[PDB]
Specification:
Elements: H1 3-16, H2 25-36, H3 41-53
Length: 54
Amino acid sequence: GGSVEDIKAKMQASIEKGGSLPKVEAKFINYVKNCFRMTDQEAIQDLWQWRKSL
């Protein structure tokens, strides 16, 4: 379907078209997990690692 890659691309798309990602780990986890159901510790770790490098 979409996987983690789709989520990253979508977030990047919104960011490029006028968006922003929470700098807080907990706020980030809540946004990604709640928005993309990313409740997987692996996905959260990768998504968080991405935010840290983003």
